[PDB]
Enzyme design. Structure first.
Site, short mmCIF file in Angstrom:
data_model
loop_
_atom_site.label_atom_id
_atom_site.label_comp_id
_atom_site.label_asym_id
_atom_site.label_seq_id
_atom_site.Cartn_x
_atom_site.Cartn_y
_atom_site.Cartn_z
NE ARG A 106 -3.71 -2.10 2.68
CZ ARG A 106 -3.30 -3.29 3.10
NH1 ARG A 106 -2.00 -3.53 3.26
NH2 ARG A 106 -4.17 -4.25 3.36
NE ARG A 169 -9.93 -7.79 5.05
CZ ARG A 169 -9.32 -6.89 4.30
NH1 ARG A 169 -8.31 -6.18 4.80
NH2 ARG A 169 -9.71 -6.68 3.05
#
Ligand code: NAI
Ligand code: NAI
Ligand code: NAI
Ligand code: NAI
Ligand code: FBP
Ligand code: FBP
Lengths: 330, 328, 330, 328
Positions: A106, A169
């Site tokens: 990222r 998650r």
């Protein structure tokens, strides 16, 4: 047409105390479309403006979104820009930018995405001076910090989606092992939305019962391996999903919508969103995720979370790295 | 985690409540919009997703399951009719080839019947009591072919039909009046395609009709503005596909709206596609007319009074659909 | 002790563009408490103030309402007055006043309820000058007209619950005969919320199919008797329910909430609410129910509804008698 | 209206999908708030209401059914377990005598058992596969009594317990912090009443514990403010009843919350009352403890680690609860 069917009332010409809640999504790719779909089905805004440089595709998407309105409560959905249709919007959701390729960090999208934000943020400052800015573009933490510097807006109104997704998650994976509702699992992921994220094992629990009863060191070797396998699946989730379908969109669309709900509905609800670190754990001049109270004014309070000595050291290391990554881009 | 949660041996025998299972076959643009909407609106207790593209499906299931903490739960999983999808209450079939730019829904028939012959064999064996909701195009002929192949009762073979076309008509008319589309009561009946019929004779808002007497007694300037609105409805798929390449969001909501009437036993009137057995002298074909939808599928049919011109157009649509199926 | 748990953010001192949606319910008897319960479960407001002259009972009700908050999305529910807690509320819902006894007419409550309104509306004009007033107190039409005269507010912002309830009763009874969803039955009740109400048989329909195919006169005698029996059950609904449990509350609580939703969510949705008549069918200087577009500014448009000669004559007669009932009290 | 809607002869044969039926027995203040909440939150497909006050019940059913156009539909009706209530998936019992100003919940036991013996006989005969949700006070002792009279699997007999008290606890704490009560995770376990236990050891907000080490370590001013908040939780019913006569709204939302976890198969953790089968050396009694709730009732039990004081307080509560049951 239809002026003989509906008769206009001249008394309704002056606007009442109630002002429609306007939102604007800038960047309508995979993430921006999932946000728009969820926010329409869950009836977040009274009017929602969609802004993108790909005009044709956007026009097609707005047509498709507007055709499903009879099945849900209404929202004035339209294509537009900050300068005209998006003026004085209450929340600006920025997803615009380059997404990561397979195995790409990222952090390597930073230079390209700051270039995109420089074009966008100037109009947000001039036409939406009182708006809450919700940043989704990656690297989410650094893009939130850069938005703060560029706009000069109060730090409470510059929020990044951060680890709200990572926390969801972690809870889902733990809930699959126990076969329960993920909403009954209370486990957090703090820090960078990326490789240096920190699982808060010291407080992870279901119904008040902690998963790590004492310290990580006092846990059996077989238990340490099974819990680490769960955390490794959380940090590799983006890589694992991108390798299979090419990108991620559904879970981030719901995480972003969940943050818009706490703001619009003035809920004062605790979420691990990204925002300016202004003192805690000796961390400063950076943005990262820690539990915070979210409401109509943005970040209103911060949980003074007690961490383990190892969890705090990891958070401090995550922050030093993020500061160095931003410093290198000048 | 066996020392964190203690299993209860009393919960070994199953209670009167059986979880509502649904299966979506075909996870492309349409299937994934259906799955997303059906999860956010909490339609099923368990939802199985079936597709021949295994890797992409596995990635989609991961993404869907990660957003569960933000909504009420559903057991979302990848699987097949033969194992995970056994005895599902509703089978939603979107699998198949979609139309290219400028292509007709009718010319996708032979390709999608080949795909359906492979799929429907397992549905008849493992889901003998299921409602089948067909979305694959040409939706009316795919619904009729599913009826012939499965041999299931006609009440349990439903096509998405003109639920989407009706929603488009209402949105366009509501944009002209600046009102909630749920307050516009206007229907599109017949084929989900070029030969669809706007029911101008009954179109209204709050009981007030848009065509006060007959279409012939309407001024020329009014006839032109109303026709422009209908033409935008028939060209909607072509206009959207030309801009983004396909349609998904509105059909995902229309399909979910049909599953709500079935699962929640609502007895609600919708223009879904189904077998015509005599109405307006029309039979041996599937098309959309207002019908009561509930847990047993199509329970009743609205004995809708049409104008002489609207009835003739509906009859022409049916003859055309029968000829398209006969040629294949 | 909790100041060391949550750290306040000094950046959130200045208020953003988002202002919480405030509502106030005046009069918390059977009707007011059903409105409050429904409006909390359906999350209409950000903050809801409850006002009643029976202080002790009100304090108990607020305690009960606030204890159920963890099961629904939050609302700042509190006891208060227009002068302090209710200042600048967006919607004022007035259900305060005397209710009808068994066999009593709604019209005979007029004088007593105008005396209650004169005391209440004095503060509404001073502390809520920009509010929408939603009147439920009986006779709902004449009470809506009196509120308009007393406050001097724009006619678009003075709305009565009217025949939204009567329309819902008509649809339910017809839907029971067909065994369908009442939301699929499109039948209206217009005029006075009372004995002189008018069923619009000329437009009653399901899926576009009218229940009266031509005219009421061309209907068979056995069909005329079955349809009249359904309408008579609608006009006698209040008497039949009051004779059995002493009052009505649940259906009016949902009808009132459904009107609040069209306003707060700027829906532009058609409802038969009560409001000032400005020449439709030659009717003026009176409030009654006819289909109208409802939104954040109140009544924005009126459906130019085509009625039969008999339906129009009945509506005109309903208005002449409502005007005479109000004239006799002044 | 047989010439308006034409019935479909194929819909005569039923499908694998069967409507979710629930029955509420005892429709006073508590039962009327359960019904209103359950209708607005669209819990069941059919909801039958049962009470000995026939004329008052007829009035409430007319009122509830008139509001149907405003919400998703439910078949609301007055009836009895023997005819309209047969094969109910969930049986919710709120019937019985409520407590007066200053009256202890436990003293309502002798009278309410008599009421229950008439009701349960028909529940066993006409709803043998049902889940029984017990609200009538003393809730814990009425749950164990229901379990004993019916003979149903222990998993299907659920009491409302300390779900309500937990919601009051979270609300009072969130008031101090000015946050959403859903962001506070603090529990009340054991008997729903005077001997209830606040789990201070695990009380927290966003992972952050309200009691950092042990209660005894707390500064005297901090432990007095915390004790004050718990004193308001145990005295909440007394304080509300003295002001309005009874409680109805918060229990109506707590019972609907338990019903949502059952109908939707959520596997959610709620502190409901159920049979103790050995936890903390406690058995042959019913009390609240965090448990996994789903379509089969109590599926799992949280093996919750408690402070030495919290554990001894919980077992004392159980020993005296079993003494009250033996005096009957
Ligand atoms: N915060 C998180 O947890 C997540 C963040 N992301 C990030 O979100 C971003 C978007 O990713 P995707 O939607 O998957 O890819 P994408 O390529 O489909 O989306 C980018 C969109 O932004 C538009 N755009 C680019 N420059 C623009 C400008 N100046 N103004 C307006 N629109 C402009 C593009 O036309 C395109 O529609 C990426 O940076 C990705 O890494 C993605 C998933 C989760
Ligand atoms: N009824 C209506 O109103 C509408 C119908 N449609 C139709 O729905 C269908 C879906 O199209 P899209 O999602 O846009 O295209 P798509 O190409 O993205 O989706 C097709 C999917 O079906 C899968 N598939 C193909 N054969 C299969 C088999 N034998 N078993 C399982 N999966 C199989 C493919 O792997 C793919 O995931 C098309 O036929 C389209 O024309 C589209 C829009 C509205
Ligand atoms: N429009 C409609 O469709 C319906 C209208 N109603 C009407 O609603 C009104 C209230 O009905 P219920 O709840 O049954 O009566 P109620 O007797 O239960 O309650 C009225 C409440 O008003 C309060 N109150 C009186 N004067 C007040 C003041 N100046 N300020 C604040 N509070 C004040 C009282 O303390 C009491 O709690 C009646 O006029 C009744 O006819 C009732 C049902 C439906
Ligand atoms: N935390 C909790 O679990 C709470 C428990 N409760 C309990 O709920 C019970 C009901 O309370 P309320 O509704 O306030 O009182 P209530 O007196 O208004 O309601 C009792 C109702 O039961 C009916 N009934 C009596 N015997 C019956 C029978 N054999 N069959 C059918 N119906 C019968 C009566 O006709 C009456 O309508 C009380 O025992 C109260 O203590 C109340 C609030 C919260
Ligand atoms: O499981 P508990 O402690 O009863 O709390 C349940 C509540 O917690 C939540 O999951 C919030 O969790 P967190 O506050 O830990 O993020 C809510 O969505 C849910 O209603
Ligand atoms: O405008 P009306 O006549 O009050 O009807 C409102 C109802 O109409 C609906 O749009 C259904 O309309 P149709 O029956 O024409 O499909 C509902 O969703 C809505 O609740």
């Amino acid at each position: 047409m239809f002026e003989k069917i509906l008769l206009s009332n001249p008394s309704a010409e002056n606007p009442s105390s109630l002002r429609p809640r306007k939102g604007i999504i800038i960047g309508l790719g995979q993430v921006g479309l999932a946000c728009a779909y969820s926010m329409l089905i869950q009836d977040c805004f009274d009017e929602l403006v969609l802004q993108d440089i790909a005009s044709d595709k956007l026009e097609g998407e707005v047509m498709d979104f507007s055709h499903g309105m009879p099945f849900i409560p209404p929202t004035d959905i339209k294509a537009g820009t900050i300068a005209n249709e998006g003026r004085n919007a209450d929340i600006v959701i920025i997803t615009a930018g380059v997404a990561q390729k397979e195995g790409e960090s990222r952090l390597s999208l930073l230079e390209r995405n700051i270039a995109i934000y420089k074009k966008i943020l100037a109009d947000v400052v001039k036409y939406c001076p009182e708006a809450i800015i919700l940043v989704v573009t990656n690297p989410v933490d650094i893009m939130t910090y850069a938005t703060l510097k560029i706009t000069g807006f109060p730090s409470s109104r510059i929020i990044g989606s951060g680890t709200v997704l990572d926390t969801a998650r972690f809870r889902t994976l733990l809930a699959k092992e126990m076969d329960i509702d993920p909403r009954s699992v209370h486990a957090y992921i703090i820090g960078e939305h990326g490789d240096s994220e920190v699982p808060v094992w010291s407080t992870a629990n279901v119904g008040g019962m902690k998963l790590v009863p004492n310290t990580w060191a006092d846990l059996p070797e077989d238990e340490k391996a099974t819990l680490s396998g769960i955390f490794q699946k959380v940090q590799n989730a983006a890589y694992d999903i991108i390798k299979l379908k090419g990108y991620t969109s559904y879970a981030i669309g719901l995480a972003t919508t969940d943050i818009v709900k706490a703001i619009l509905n003035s809920q004062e609800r605790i979420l691990t969103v990204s925002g300016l670190m202004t003192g805690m754990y000796g961390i400063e001049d950076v943005c990262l995720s820690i539990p915070r109270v979210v409401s109509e004014r943005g970040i209103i309070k911060t949980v003074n979370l007690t961490l383990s000595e190892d969890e705090e050291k990891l958070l401090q290391q995550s922050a030093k790295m993020l500061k160095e990554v931003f410093d290198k881009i000048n």
